[PDB]
Amino acid sequence: AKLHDYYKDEVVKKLMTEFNYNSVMQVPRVEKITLNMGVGEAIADKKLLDNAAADLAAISGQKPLITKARKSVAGFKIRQGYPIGCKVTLRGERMWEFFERLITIAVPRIRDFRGLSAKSFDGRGNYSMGVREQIIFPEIDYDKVDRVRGLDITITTTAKSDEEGRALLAAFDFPFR
Amino acid sequence: RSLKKGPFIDLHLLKKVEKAVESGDKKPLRTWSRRSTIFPNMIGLTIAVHNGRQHVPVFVTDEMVGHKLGEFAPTRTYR
Amino acid sequence: ARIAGINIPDHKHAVIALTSIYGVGKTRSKAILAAAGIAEDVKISELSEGQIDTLRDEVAKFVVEGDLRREISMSIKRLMDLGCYRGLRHRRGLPVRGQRTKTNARTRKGPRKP
Amino acid sequence: NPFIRFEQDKKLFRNALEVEGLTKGFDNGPLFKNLNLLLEVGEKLAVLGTNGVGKSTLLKTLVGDLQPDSGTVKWSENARIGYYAQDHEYEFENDLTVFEWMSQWKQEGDDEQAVRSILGRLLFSQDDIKKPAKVLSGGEKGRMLFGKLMMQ
Amino acid sequence: MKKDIHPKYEEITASCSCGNVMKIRSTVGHDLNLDVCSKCHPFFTGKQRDVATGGRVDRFNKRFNI
RNA sequence: UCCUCCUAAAGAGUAACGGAGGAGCACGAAGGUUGGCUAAUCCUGGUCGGACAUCAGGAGGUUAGUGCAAUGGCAUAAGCC
RNA sequence: CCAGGGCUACACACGUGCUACAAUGGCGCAUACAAAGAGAAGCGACCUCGCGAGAGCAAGCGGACCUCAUAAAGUGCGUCGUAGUCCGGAUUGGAGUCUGCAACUCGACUCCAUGAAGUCGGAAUCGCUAGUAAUCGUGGAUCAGAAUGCCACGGUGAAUAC
Ligand SMILES: Nc1ncnc2c1ncn2[C@@H]1O[C@H](COP(=O)(O)OP(=O)(O)OP(=O)(O)O)[C@@H](O)[C@H]1O
Ligand SMILES: [Mg+2]
Ligand SMILES: [Mg+2]
Ligand SMILES: [Mg+2]
Ligand SMILES: [Mg+2]
Ligand SMILES: [Mg+2]
Ligand SMILES: [Mg+2]
Ligand SMILES: [Mg+2]
Ligand SMILES: [Mg+2]
Ligand code: NA
C-alpha cells in the first residue's frame, strides 16, 4: 500500500546514503511476513485449533496453514501427523497492508506498551516478535474470542546482517528502544 | 492512626539521631525505642532495635518513614 | 449499560448497576447520579444512550477495576518486599490486623487441613 | 450393565416449575384445564395415566415447544433443560456416525478423549463407533440419549 | 488467491478521536474508531510520567505541619 | 518347516546340542501411472513453551526413511504428497 | 529497682456465645409508647465546624428540676419480586477521630473501596409450663481508653401438657 511506495521513495534514499551502497537494489528489503501460533493443547481437543485458525484469518485475510508434528516426541505426548498449530505467510500487497496496520494501531494498543526490543534479530537480519495477546488487533471484538492465545510475528528481510536489518526496520518508524 | 499531630518519638533517640548524622554512617545504635517513628533524617542509618532479647539491625531505607521502629523487629519466634 | 469494564446488569436501578464496577460502592454510586442529574429510582435500560456518555466520564475521575487492581497490588506488594510485620503476615497467609489465630481466622487460613 | 450417572452444573435452589393455567386441547375437549404446578427442586414427579389422555402433550408444552393458551411456564433463572422425547427419530438423521453424532454435544470436554469414554462407558466397543448413528437399533438409540445428557 | 476460501477483504475508514484519519484495508465489515494511534501514543514523552510510582518521605513531610 | 548375518578359508556350496535375531502375516491401497517434493541432528531469534512441539534464518549432508528381523539397496529416489 | 518483650504465639481439638443464611425480610422517608440507673481532677445542654468518628466556645447539675438520653421492634407510604440477591458481613488496602508519656508487637470507633464461608446444618445434644419461651432495645459495675461477657431494666409476647 502506501508503505510500499514510501519504501521506494524514502527508505531507499535513506539507506543508500547511510550505508554507502553502489547499486540501487543492493539495499535490503522485506520479502515476507510469517504469522503462526502453536496452540499445543489441541492434542486433547480439536475445536481449539479451528478457533485459532479463525483468529489468524481475521487478523490477516488468508486461510491459515495447519501444521503437523515433524517427529513424535514423548515429552508432550505427540506423534507424527498430529495438527499442532497454524501458519500464515504474507507477501507483496497483503504483507504491506498488514504491516502498515501493525505499526500504527495494533502495537500502540498493547497494554502497558514499553517498547519492542531491538536485539531480537536472528544474527542475519530477520526480526521475530511475540505479542502474547490477539486482542490488540481491531479485528477482534473481545466478545467472540475466548482465549488469550498470542501470535508470533517474523520479519523476513533480505538484509545480509542484523546491523542493516536494524536500520531498515528503524526507517519504517519501528518502536525500538 | 496516632493523632492529628506530632509524630511521637523519644528524646534520647532523637538526640542520638542528631549526633549520628554528623559523622555519616557509623556503628549501629543500640536503642530500645520500639514506639519511635522513623523520621526522614534517619534514612541510610543502621539503627538496631530491641525485640525483647536481641537488638536486631534494621537498615532504614527511603520507604520506611510512616512506620515505627519496633515494626521491623519481630518479637516472637515460630518454626 | 456499558461502562469501563461492563455494565451488564440490566433491569436494575441505577444506584445498583454501578455497584458492579470494582471501585464503586453505594455512596460512590450516589455521587455519580447526583452530578449526572439522574434520580436514584431510574432504571438502566430506560435511560438514553446520551446519558451513558455522561456516566462514563464521571466514573473515569475515580479509580476503577482496571487501575485499582494495580493500585491495590502495589500496596500489598510493597509491604511484602519491605519486610514489614504486615509483610510477614501477608506471606504466611495469616490475619494482619492483629487478631486471634488460636482457633479462629479461617478466612485467611482457609479450609481446615488436619 | 451400562454405567450411567447424571451430574449437575449449577443446581438451582428454590423451585423450578411455575404453571398458572394451561387449558390446552388439540381438536376435542381440552386434556387439562388449569394445572397449577410447582416443583421445588426435586419431586421427581412421575406423570401417569392411561394412554391417550395427553401426558406427552403436557410435557411437550411444559418445555415450550407447543405453545399453550396458558401464560408461560416460567422456567427458573438458570435452568438447563434436557429432553428425552417419547419419540426420538429426528435426532438420528443426516447420516452422522456414532462418534460424530456424540461429539457435538459438549461444552468444555475434549473432542478425542472424555467423549470416547462417556460414549464407550455405556457399552460401545472400539469398532462400534465407526458406523452411522442412524443404523443403531432400539436400546442403543435410547442409550445415546442417556449419554447425550452425560456431557450436557 | 484460491477463489473464495478466504474471508472478505475490503477497504475501511479507520479514524482516531484526535484525527489520524487513515484509510486501510481490513476484514471487519464496518469502520472502526480507536484511541490515539502510533502518531499520538505517549510512548516517547510520558516516560517520566510513567515511572513515578512511590513517594513516602515527602508525603510524610507534608504531614509535618509543626 | 521357512527367512537374515557370522563360522565359510575374496566364484557357487560347506558342519557341530556353534554365535546372534525373526515368520506362519499385512494392504482394494500400503498396487499401476502422471505431476510435484527431499531428511536426522544441531545452532541463533521467537507468547504461553519447558532439555524437546509449532515458526524464521544458517551449518550439515542422508549419520534420516522403508508396514515387520537382518543383509544388500535406494536421489532418475525403491523415501514423502 | 528499671527498660523492652510475653500472657494476644497456631498443622490441630473441645466448651460457652455473637452474627447470618433472608420476603411474618433488606433499604429509604415520616410517626408514636418504657422502665431502671449513673454522674464533681464527673455527666457535660445550646450553637458553629466536620458527610462521620469528633472538634471550639461552653450553661446546668454532687441532682423527682440538669446531663447521659433519640428507646427498638411497631405503625403508614415506596422499592426490592427469589437472586449468593439491595441477604450476609468476614478479610484486606487507603484516609482519619479520640483516651493515654506511648495504639508496631496488641485499643475502640468513623469514612471510601473490597465484599468471602453461609441457601437451615451427620451421629448426638440443650433450655423452657406464663408475662415463661421467643425476639427488641436500655442502663450499671470494673474502667484514662478497651466487651458479643457479667449484673440488672422494660416493650411485643406464644404452643402444649391425654
Ligand atoms: N397434532 C394432533 N392433532 C390432533 N390430535 C392430537 C394431536 N396430538 C395429539 N392428539 C390427541 O390428543 C391426545 C394427546 O395424546 P399424545 O400424542 O400427547 O400422547 P399421550 O396421550 O400422552 O399418549 P401415550 O401415553 O400413548 O404416549 C390424544 O388423544 C391424541 O390422539
Ligand atoms: Mg563364499
Ligand atoms: Mg573360496
Ligand atoms: Mg562336502
Ligand atoms: Mg510400498
Ligand atoms: Mg515420479
Ligand atoms: Mg511405489
Ligand atoms: Mg515491666
Ligand atoms: Mg489469658
Ligand atoms: Na404420549
Known binding residue D53? Answer is yes
C-beta atoms surrounding E9 within 10 Å: 14
| Helix ranges restricted to H, C1-114 | 14-17, 27-36, 49-60, 65-82, 85-91, 106-109
DSSP state of D67: P
Q: Count the domains in chain A.
A: 1
> What are the beta bridge partners of residue E12?
E24
Kindly provide the residue ranges of all beta strands, DSSP E only, lying in chain A, ordered along the sequence: 30-38, 67-68, 83-90, 127-130, 152-157
Query: Closest approach of chain C CAs to the CA of B9, in angstroms?
Result: 19
Range of A142's domain? Answer: 1-177
Closest nucleotide over all strands to A155 (CA to C1'): F56
Partners of residue A109 in chain E, C-beta under 8 Å: 34-35
Pocket, ligand 1, Cβ cutoff 6 A: D 26-27, 51-57, 86
Decide if B58 contacts E50 (C-beta within 8 A). no
| Helix ranges restricted to H, A21-107 | 47-59, 93-101
Which of C78, C84, C94 to mutate to test binding with chain B, by most B CBs within 10 Å of its CB? C84
SS3 D97: strand
DSSP state of E17: T
- Ligand 3 centre distance from Cα of residue A60 (Å): 72
For a pocket test of ligand 1, which of D24, D26, D61 has the largest count of ligand atoms closer than 8 A to its C-beta?
A: D26
Give B51 CA → G146 C1' in Å: 25
For a pocket test of ligand 1, which of D28, D51, D53, D57 has the largest count of ligand atoms closer than 8 A to its C-beta?
A: D57
Domain at A128, CATH number:
3.30.1440.10
Measuring CA to CA, how many Å separate A79 from each of A38, A68, A83, D117? 15, 9, 9, 21
Length of chain B: 79
Decide if E23 contacts A91 (C-beta within 8 A). no
C-beta atoms surrounding D106 within 10 Å: 17
CA C66 to chain centre: 10
Residue C20 CA to residue C7 CA, distance in Å, equals 7
Decide if A39 contacts A48 (C-beta within 8 A). yes
Q: Which residues contact C86 (CB under 8 A, 6 or more apart)?
A: C79, C96
Measuring CA to CA, how many Å separate D128 from each of A169, D53, D132, D135? 58, 39, 10, 11
Measuring CA to CA, how many Å separate B23 from each of B19, B76, D41? 7, 34, 79
| From B40, B62, B64, residue closest to E61, measured CB to CB | B40
Structure-determination approach: cryo-EM
